[PDB]
Amino acid sequence: MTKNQALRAALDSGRLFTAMAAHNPLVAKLAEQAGFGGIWGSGFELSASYAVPDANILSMSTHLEMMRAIASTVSIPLIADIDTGFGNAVNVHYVVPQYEAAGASAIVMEDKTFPKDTQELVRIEEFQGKIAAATAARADRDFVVIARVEALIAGLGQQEAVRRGQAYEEAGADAILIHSRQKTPDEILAFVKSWPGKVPLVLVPTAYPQLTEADIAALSKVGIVIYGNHAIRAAVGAVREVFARIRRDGGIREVDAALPSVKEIIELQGDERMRAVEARYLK
Amino acid sequence: MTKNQALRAALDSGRLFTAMAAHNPLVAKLAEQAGFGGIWGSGFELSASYAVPDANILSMSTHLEMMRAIASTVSIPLIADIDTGFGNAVNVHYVVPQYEAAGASAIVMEDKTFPKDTQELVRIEEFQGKIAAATAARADRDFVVIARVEALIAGLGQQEAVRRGQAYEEAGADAILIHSRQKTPDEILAFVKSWPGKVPLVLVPTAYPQLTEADIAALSKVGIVIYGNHAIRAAVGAVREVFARIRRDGGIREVDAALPSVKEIIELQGDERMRAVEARYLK
Amino acid sequence: MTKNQALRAALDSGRLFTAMAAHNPLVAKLAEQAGFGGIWGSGFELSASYAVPDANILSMSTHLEMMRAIASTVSIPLIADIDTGFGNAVNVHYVVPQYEAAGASAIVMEDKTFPKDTQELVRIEEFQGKIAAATAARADRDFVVIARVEALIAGLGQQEAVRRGQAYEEAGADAILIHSRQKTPDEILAFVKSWPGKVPLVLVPTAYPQLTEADIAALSKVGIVIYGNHAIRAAVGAVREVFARIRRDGGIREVDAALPSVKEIIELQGDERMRAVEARYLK
Amino acid sequence: MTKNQALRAALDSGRLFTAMAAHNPLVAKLAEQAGFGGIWGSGFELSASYAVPDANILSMSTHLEMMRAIASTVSIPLIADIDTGFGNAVNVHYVVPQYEAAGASAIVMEDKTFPKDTQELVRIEEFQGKIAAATAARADRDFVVIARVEALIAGLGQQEAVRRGQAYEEAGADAILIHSRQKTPDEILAFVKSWPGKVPLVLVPTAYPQLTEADIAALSKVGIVIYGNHAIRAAVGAVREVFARIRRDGGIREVDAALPSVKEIIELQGDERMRAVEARYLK
Ligand SMILES: O[C@@H]1[C@@H](O)[C@@H](O)OC[C@H]1O
Ligand SMILES: O[C@@H]1[C@@H](O)[C@@H](O)OC[C@H]1O
Ligand SMILES: O[C@@H]1[C@@H](O)[C@@H](O)OC[C@H]1O
Ligand SMILES: O[C@@H]1[C@@H](O)[C@@H](O)OC[C@H]1O
Ligand SMILES: O=C([O-])C(=O)[O-]
Ligand SMILES: O=C([O-])C(=O)[O-]
Ligand SMILES: O=C([O-])C(=O)[O-]
Ligand SMILES: O=C([O-])C(=O)[O-]
Ligand SMILES: [Cl-]
Ligand SMILES: [Cl-]
Ligand SMILES: [Cl-]
Ligand SMILES: [Cl-]
Ligand SMILES: [Mg+2]
Ligand SMILES: [Mg+2]
Ligand SMILES: [Mg+2]
Ligand SMILES: [Mg+2]
Ligand code: NA
Ligand code: NA
Ligand code: NA
Ligand code: NA
């Protein structure tokens, strides 16, 4: 079963699929080993690892090559964040095939205008055209196109958010990712209740840690839950703490015992496989 | 004062310079903020972040571009690990100028043969030629060339290790990095005592957490101490733990409070600077 | 004298500076050897060499790395085509320092909106902000910022074209590149006559081969003439012809004599330098 | 029929397959349009386009990404030059899957030692192990592994050249590429006559333009003829000539008529396809 079939099977079966953010292949491997359903190739986490704002500063190829390296490391589906498609429908058309060829099983594209000005969203018809270009360019029909509706964030209201969602589904979107920045999950939950479309919803509840997977499973219309930036946050917290301890203690004497050993990193690099290759082919 | 002058000033002054491993620019920024003297652009940490063995599997350009991204983020000197120079003296000659142009203040090159066979080290004269090619290719004489002696690891003994160190210094090496895999730091300390050369020594005491910076400062001949892989180890430990907690709890309800906030990552991405640029130029 | 000083000296002296398009470093080296004043790092020629449309399909990093490779090969100034700045003023701010660090002595940025819709140009004030962000981000004040006015191409008329030119110069543009698609050079020449600003003009007269350098030197207000796509055209013509001859003749028997020899390519690769490095450092 | 099946079908059918060198996708497209059977992703042509010696100076990723861009442009098989495998059998194992995933239908790997010293070839058994690692790592059994024997160039004689060829075929090589630097094709033809193996031979007769395809078809044992560097030579000759004419004439007045038009380059960039995408999806 291909990774694309696996993703599709999850969406079609009604199971709740979980995806975790990853800013490099090692983190993606740890996510797979932890049991998540898929990897989220987050633009926010990649730009954060590079210490640059998440505002289309990183090159498209830096993200695309990272997607390729992650997909060649894990056996679970990869969902790629392609922001606004790096341009208009023509750019979308040329970019989607490269993400599919890099091994991603899905892309997430949002309806925000690019670049930011001093409208917040692109016209409904313009975005429908971008979604249609994405589904036209894919080679494997199992490849998934997810349209991200930013109407709530833009402060446009629930009625406009549902209208865009329905228009994107009409254009060929396989799932709709709806996002909220409200303090409470009231807004998001009201959208889910009102959602009239046939395709599944995708939530990124980073702003609402109180919404557990059990709470989300209770929402039959949601097919995917994404943990949007927890890997980079976990890494920053531990690195910052270990660096401060080394500088306070003037060394690694107290900190070494608590860290994973060098041998554990070498195993995560796939040393066992390398050992078999060396044993059978280094002659 | 340029980063290269800063590094040189540290070596020449007699202060003990500390450098921390970094596998991406964010980690490098956290190292700078923590107070380390320099960043170590570790090939072991970069290959580990890609989940591939540290055996010249990653492309030279993947490491070189990472060095460029780290140097454009931090204000402290960057020491680049270039393994065996990606070839012979001709390759060294073409590669060193690219690392210098990427912003690194020093390179570390070791005398192991490449690629591994089924001798362990290259001939003394061959390596002298590689060091000479490195110092000939550098543009800024302040740029530092560090020769890494692997004779102890190769099991060749102390006398051969000192002989190579002296031969590399004669060829132009600005510092000698000596490494041991022995369980106890006895071997390393005996080498330091016996070292007759004029240039400073560089230690990577990952195998001896008991050797503190105070213990190393007591070794007048050592000018640099490098923490070789603690960033990737710290990151792996926290990521693996947070991923397991999310999967055990079926969500981020218990884990979110402990993590650095999204706002802290956005500040680390340099949002303040981005805010000034937006305020003054988005019109 | 730095490449940036060289460019500046040309602009300030009143000499007419010539720049030739190059899609790779070899072509750039041939341009230098032929005697041109500078290299034009054409987005049209790079996208053509990749067989993709010149419509922001290539990644910014593919062009930036090509600029780096060209600047490390030639000793004459490189003028980089950065299209619309890969975004708004914030993107311009983050991108310009990378082009300067790659070795380019100037960038050319145009006032077209990106991406294309189904207004043609961005507002005058928005572009002024992008030019100001570019000149604020440069480190070396000798680095040159050239603003390309597309008002004539957009069919907006001469009065609006001059107004934008003056507004961009007010925002800090060091030169104004004005372009025409009219069949005859009447439109372009009328703009030059009317130009009231103090900075030099830049012409890309690809559409008017009848306008010679002597004709352009006669235009005191023009400081740079760029040959926009002749390298890729020359290469396509000869390659296509040699390929057809080989397939017609069933071999290279008739064609080999006319081609430059393998020895000539090896010299262009800088074999002599490589021979000195081998002789002095391979030991 | 996949590109790999197409290549295999050519080798198995007994037809003589022709492959032309290409240093970028545009040249590769022109080769396809001219009628060649396949593209040769020459390391010599790519390093020449970058104005650097063909001595493993370019990064492996620079060549691999170029292979990816060429394969996504042409519909005919691509044969990738991977030099000595970028290391030993372990490196070969990690590299081959990346070339296959980039779209190449075959790789060519030679038995020279890397890097050059002050033996010329690696031991027969070491190379057999590298070939075995290559055929073990490929996913599609149709993917072709070509072993290049440099024994004649090394001055080791015909008997040793045939012995290596047979040993590499025993290790799994699908074809043997044999090369000569002798002035006359006597040496090469004698090798072909003596060749006792079952797999086809591959010739790169750049040094013998007198050996036509008809002469090679007459050699039943040769299954592929590669034109090794004619694209870069043709391009250099025309570019150098057009640049000299522009500088002599002080303009493009005399040269423009002879060049392919801008409209022809735009068609080669695939503008027609872009026009359909714009018409159907830009809304
Ligand atoms: O080879 C893969 C292994 O590394 C892991 O990810 O589990 C599934 C496999 O297909
Ligand atoms: O701009 C730099 C700042 O970001 C930090 O790293 O401290 C020193 C500065 O030069
Ligand atoms: O080294 C350079 C040489 O290669 C050429 O381009 O002419 C000027 C020099 O600075
Ligand atoms: O789409 C391809 C076309 O562009 C050309 O190369 O011929 C064969 C096709 O498969
Ligand atoms: O980048 C992300 O993680 C996102 O878009 O949610
Ligand atoms: O890669 C490293 O960190 C090293 O070489 O010590
Ligand atoms: O790309 C070019 O050559 C241009 O913009 O003129
Ligand atoms: O690089 C080449 O073209 C070769 O190896 O023949
Ligand atoms: Cl990372
Ligand atoms: Cl990374
Ligand atoms: Cl090219
Ligand atoms: Cl190229
Ligand atoms: Mg994102
Ligand atoms: Mg290392
Ligand atoms: Mg352009
Ligand atoms: Mg080659
Ligand atoms: Na990263
Ligand atoms: Na990394
Ligand atoms: Na090119
Ligand atoms: Na090229």
Side-chain angles (χ1 to χ4, degrees):
Chain A
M1 180 179 230
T2 69
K3 285 172 174 180
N4 302 342
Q5 298 179 314
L7 185 45
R8 209 50 100 142
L11 281 183
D12 296 341
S13 72
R15 288 178 275 124
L16 175 60
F17 185 86
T18 62
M20 171 60 77
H23 47 276
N24 59 46
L26 177 61
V27 166
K29 186 168 194 173
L30 293 172
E32 181 177 345
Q33 290 183 358
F36 292 92
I39 298 307
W40 165 229
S42 176
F44 174 81
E45 287 219 348
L46 189 64
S47 65
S49 77
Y50 270 89
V52 296
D54 181 25
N56 295 289
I57 294 169
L58 285 187
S59 179
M60 178 270 289
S61 72
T62 295
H63 181 264
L64 166 68
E65 291 310 323
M66 180 51 75
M67 296 306 103
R68 198 188 313 284
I70 291 178
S72 66
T73 299
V74 300
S75 67
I76 56 172
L78 166 65
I79 302 179
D81 178 2
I82 57 166
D83 294 3
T84 62
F86 304 104
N88 58 22
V90 179
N91 295 285
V92 173
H93 196 81
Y94 282 92
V95 146
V96 172
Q98 293 175 256
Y99 274 87
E100 183 172 13
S105 288
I107 51 88
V108 172
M109 188 173 45
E110 68 203 40
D111 56 3
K112 288 197 278 202
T113 63
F114 172 69
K116 179 205 301 200
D117 214 345
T118 344
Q119 205 72 57
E120 302 297 300
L121 308 196
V122 302
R123 291 169 297 103
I124 289 189
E125 324 82 59
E126 182 181 352
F127 203 70
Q128 288 184 115
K130 289 168 73 163
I131 290 292
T135 60
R138 78 178 154 206
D140 178 356
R141 357 268 48 169
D142 290 333
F143 181 81
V144 173
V145 176
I146 302 169
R148 174 167 180 150
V149 173
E150 288 287 289
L152 297 177
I153 302 302
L156 304 177
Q158 189 175 99
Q159 99 170 297
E160 175 60 19
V162 172
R163 178 172 172 253
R164 284 174 173 267
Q166 294 189 293
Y168 303 166
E169 173 183 357
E170 308 178 336
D174 294 301
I176 297 305
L177 188 166
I178 178 72
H179 203 50
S180 184
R181 90 216 305 187
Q182 238 46 246
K183 268 302 301 187
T184 67
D186 291 346
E187 173 174 79
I188 272 292
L189 294 180
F191 177 97
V192 168
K193 176 63 185 188
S194 77
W195 179 248
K198 307 181 159 176
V199 301
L201 295 183
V202 185
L203 300 185
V204 190
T206 53
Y208 320 114
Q210 65 266 230
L211 207 63
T212 64
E213 290 179 10
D215 293 331
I216 295 173
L219 307 167
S220 299
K221 295 175 190 182
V222 177
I224 295 174
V225 56
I226 294 171
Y227 289 103
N229 53 207
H230 306 84
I232 197 70
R233 285 159 71 195
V236 161
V239 165
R240 182 171 65 176
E241 203 231 77
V242 173
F243 288 176
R245 285 183 61 199
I246 293 177
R247 293 262 36 83
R248 214 158 42 227
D249 299 354
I252 53 173
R253 193 237 290 304
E254 273 38 290
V255 89
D256 181 84
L259 302 173
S261 69
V262 177
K263 181 193 184 156
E264 293 181 70
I265 306 306
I266 288 158
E267 303 172 336
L268 278 167
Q269 289 175 296
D271 185 68
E272 288 192 4
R273 159 186 163 181
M274 186 177 64
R275 276 184 302 82
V277 170
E278 271 190 69
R280 358 261 242 203
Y281 307 107
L282 245 192
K283 298 178 178 302
Chain B
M1 180 179 230
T2 69
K3 285 172 174 180
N4 302 342
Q5 298 179 314
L7 185 45
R8 209 50 100 142
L11 281 183
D12 296 341
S13 72
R15 288 178 275 124
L16 175 60
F17 185 86
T18 62
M20 171 60 77
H23 47 276
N24 59 46
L26 177 61
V27 166
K29 186 168 194 173
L30 293 172
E32 181 177 345
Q33 290 183 358
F36 292 92
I39 298 307
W40 165 229
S42 176
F44 174 81
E45 287 219 348
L46 189 64
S47 65
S49 77
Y50 270 89
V52 296
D54 181 25
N56 295 289
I57 294 169
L58 285 187
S59 179
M60 178 270 289
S61 72
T62 295
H63 181 264
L64 166 68
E65 291 310 323
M66 180 51 75
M67 296 306 103
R68 198 188 313 284
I70 291 178
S72 66
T73 299
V74 300
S75 67
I76 56 172
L78 166 65
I79 302 179
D81 178 2
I82 57 166
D83 294 3
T84 62
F86 304 104
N88 58 22
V90 179
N91 295 285
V92 173
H93 196 81
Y94 282 92
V95 146
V96 172
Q98 293 175 256
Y99 274 87
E100 183 172 13
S105 288
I107 51 88
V108 172
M109 188 173 45
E110 68 203 40
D111 56 3
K112 288 197 278 202
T113 63
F114 172 69
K116 179 205 301 200
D117 214 345
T118 344
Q119 205 72 57
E120 302 297 300
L121 308 196
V122 302
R123 291 169 297 103
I124 289 189
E125 324 82 59
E126 182 181 352
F127 203 70
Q128 288 184 115
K130 289 168 73 163
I131 290 292
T135 60
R138 78 178 154 206
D140 178 356
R141 357 268 48 169
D142 290 333
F143 181 81
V144 173
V145 176
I146 302 169
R148 174 167 180 150
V149 173
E150 288 287 289
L152 297 177
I153 302 302
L156 304 177
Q158 189 175 99
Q159 99 170 297
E160 175 60 19
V162 172
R163 178 172 172 253
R164 284 174 173 267
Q166 294 189 293
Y168 303 166
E169 173 183 357
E170 308 178 336
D174 294 301
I176 297 305
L177 188 166
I178 178 72
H179 203 50
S180 184
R181 90 216 305 187
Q182 238 46 246
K183 268 302 301 187
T184 67
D186 291 346
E187 173 174 79
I188 272 292
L189 294 180
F191 177 97
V192 168
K193 176 63 185 188
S194 77
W195 179 248
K198 307 181 159 176
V199 301
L201 295 183
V202 185
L203 300 185
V204 190
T206 53
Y208 320 114
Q210 65 266 230
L211 207 63
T212 64
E213 290 179 10
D215 293 331
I216 295 173
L219 307 167
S220 299
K221 295 175 190 182
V222 177
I224 295 174
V225 56
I226 294 171
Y227 289 103
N229 53 207
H230 306 84
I232 197 70
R233 285 159 71 195
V236 161
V239 165
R240 182 171 65 176
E241 203 231 77
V242 173
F243 288 176
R245 285 183 61 199
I246 293 177
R247 293 262 36 83
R248 214 158 42 227
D249 299 354
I252 53 173
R253 193 237 290 304
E254 273 38 290
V255 89
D256 181 84
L259 302 173
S261 69
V262 177
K263 181 193 184 156
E264 293 181 70
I265 306 306
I266 288 158
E267 303 172 336
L268 278 167
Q269 289 175 296
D271 185 68
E272 288 192 4
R273 159 186 163 181
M274 186 177 64
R275 276 184 302 82
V277 170
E278 271 190 69
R280 358 261 242 203
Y281 307 107
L282 245 192
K283 298 178 178 302
Chain C
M1 180 179 230
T2 69
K3 285 172 174 180
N4 302 342
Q5 298 179 314
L7 185 45
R8 209 50 100 142
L11 281 183
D12 296 341
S13 72
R15 288 178 275 124
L16 175 60
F17 185 86
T18 62
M20 171 60 77
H23 47 276
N24 59 46
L26 177 61
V27 166
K29 186 168 194 173
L30 293 172
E32 181 177 345
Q33 290 183 358
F36 292 92
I39 298 307
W40 165 229
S42 176
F44 174 81
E45 287 219 348
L46 189 64
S47 65
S49 77
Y50 270 89
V52 296
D54 181 25
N56 295 289
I57 294 169
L58 285 187
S59 179
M60 178 270 289
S61 72
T62 295
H63 181 264
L64 166 68
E65 291 310 323
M66 180 51 75
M67 296 306 103
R68 198 188 313 284
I70 291 178
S72 66
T73 299
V74 300
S75 67
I76 56 172
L78 166 65
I79 302 179
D81 178 2
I82 57 166
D83 294 3
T84 62
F86 304 104
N88 58 22
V90 179
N91 295 285
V92 173
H93 196 81
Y94 282 92
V95 146
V96 172
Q98 293 175 256
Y99 274 87
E100 183 172 13
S105 288
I107 51 88
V108 172
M109 188 173 45
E110 68 203 40
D111 56 3
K112 288 197 278 202
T113 63
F114 172 69
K116 179 205 301 200
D117 214 345
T118 344
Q119 205 72 57
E120 302 297 300
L121 308 196
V122 302
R123 291 169 297 103
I124 289 189
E125 324 82 59
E126 182 181 352
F127 203 70
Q128 288 184 115
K130 289 168 73 163
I131 290 292
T135 60
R138 78 178 154 206
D140 178 356
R141 357 268 48 169
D142 290 333
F143 181 81
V144 173
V145 176
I146 302 169
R148 174 167 180 150
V149 173
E150 288 287 289
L152 297 177
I153 302 302
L156 304 177
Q158 189 175 99
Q159 99 170 297
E160 175 60 19
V162 172
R163 178 172 172 253
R164 284 174 173 267
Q166 294 189 293
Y168 303 166
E169 173 183 357
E170 308 178 336
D174 294 301
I176 297 305
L177 188 166
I178 178 72
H179 203 50
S180 184
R181 90 216 305 187
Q182 238 46 246
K183 268 302 301 187
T184 67
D186 291 346
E187 173 174 79
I188 272 292
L189 294 180
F191 177 97
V192 168
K193 176 63 185 188
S194 77
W195 179 248
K198 307 181 159 176
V199 301
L201 295 183
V202 185
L203 300 185
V204 190
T206 53
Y208 320 114
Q210 65 266 230
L211 207 63
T212 64
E213 290 179 10
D215 293 331
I216 295 173
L219 307 167
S220 299
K221 295 175 190 182
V222 177
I224 295 174
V225 56
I226 294 171
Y227 289 103
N229 53 207
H230 306 84
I232 197 70
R233 285 159 71 195
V236 161
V239 165
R240 182 171 65 176
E241 203 231 77
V242 173
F243 288 176
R245 285 183 61 199
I246 293 177
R247 293 262 36 83
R248 214 158 42 227
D249 299 354
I252 53 173
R253 193 237 290 304
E254 273 38 290
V255 89
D256 181 84
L259 302 172
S261 69
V262 177
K263 181 193 184 156
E264 293 181 70
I265 306 306
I266 288 158
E267 303 172 336
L268 278 167
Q269 289 175 296
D271 185 68
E272 288 192 4
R273 159 186 163 181
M274 186 177 64
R275 276 184 302 82
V277 170
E278 271 190 69
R280 358 261 242 203
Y281 307 107
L282 245 192
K283 298 178 178 302
Chain D
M1 180 179 230
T2 69
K3 285 172 174 180
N4 302 342
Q5 298 179 314
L7 185 45
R8 209 50 100 142
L11 281 183
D12 296 341
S13 72
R15 288 178 275 124
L16 175 60
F17 185 86
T18 62
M20 171 60 77
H23 47 276
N24 59 46
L26 177 61
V27 166
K29 186 168 194 173
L30 293 172
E32 181 177 345
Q33 290 183 358
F36 292 92
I39 298 307
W40 165 229
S42 176
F44 174 81
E45 287 219 348
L46 189 64
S47 65
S49 77
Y50 270 89
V52 296
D54 181 25
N56 295 289
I57 294 169
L58 285 187
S59 179
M60 178 270 289
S61 72
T62 295
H63 181 264
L64 166 68
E65 291 310 323
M66 180 51 75
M67 296 306 103
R68 198 188 313 284
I70 291 178
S72 66
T73 299
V74 300
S75 67
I76 56 172
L78 166 65
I79 302 179
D81 178 2
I82 57 166
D83 294 3
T84 62
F86 304 104
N88 58 22
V90 179
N91 295 285
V92 173
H93 196 81
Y94 282 92
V95 146
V96 172
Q98 293 175 256
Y99 274 87
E100 183 172 13
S105 288
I107 51 88
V108 172
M109 188 173 45
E110 68 203 40
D111 56 3
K112 288 197 278 202
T113 63
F114 172 69
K116 179 205 301 200
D117 214 345
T118 344
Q119 205 72 57
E120 302 297 300
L121 308 196
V122 302
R123 291 169 297 103
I124 289 189
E125 324 82 59
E126 182 181 352
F127 203 70
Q128 288 184 115
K130 289 168 73 163
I131 290 292
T135 60
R138 78 178 154 206
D140 178 356
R141 357 268 48 169
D142 290 333
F143 181 81
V144 173
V145 176
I146 302 169
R148 174 167 180 150
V149 173
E150 288 287 289
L152 297 177
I153 302 302
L156 304 177
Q158 189 175 99
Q159 99 170 297
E160 175 60 19
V162 172
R163 178 172 172 253
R164 284 174 173 267
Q166 294 189 293
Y168 303 166
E169 173 183 357
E170 308 178 336
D174 294 301
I176 297 305
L177 188 166
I178 178 72
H179 203 50
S180 184
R181 90 216 305 187
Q182 238 46 246
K183 268 302 301 187
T184 67
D186 291 346
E187 173 174 79
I188 272 292
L189 294 180
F191 177 97
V192 168
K193 176 63 185 188
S194 77
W195 179 248
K198 307 181 159 176
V199 301
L201 295 183
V202 185
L203 300 185
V204 190
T206 53
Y208 320 114
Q210 65 266 230
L211 207 63
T212 64
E213 290 179 10
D215 293 331
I216 295 173
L219 307 167
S220 299
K221 295 175 190 182
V222 177
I224 295 174
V225 56
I226 294 171
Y227 289 103
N229 53 207
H230 306 84
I232 197 70
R233 285 159 71 195
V236 161
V239 165
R240 182 171 65 176
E241 203 231 77
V242 173
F243 288 176
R245 285 183 61 199
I246 293 177
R247 293 262 36 83
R248 214 158 42 227
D249 299 354
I252 53 173
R253 193 237 290 304
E254 273 38 290
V255 89
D256 181 84
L259 302 172
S261 69
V262 177
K263 181 193 184 156
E264 293 181 70
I265 306 306
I266 288 158
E267 303 172 336
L268 278 167
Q269 289 175 296
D271 185 68
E272 288 192 4
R273 159 186 163 181
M274 186 177 64
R275 276 184 302 82
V277 170
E278 271 190 69
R280 358 261 242 203
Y281 307 107
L282 245 192
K283 298 178 178 302

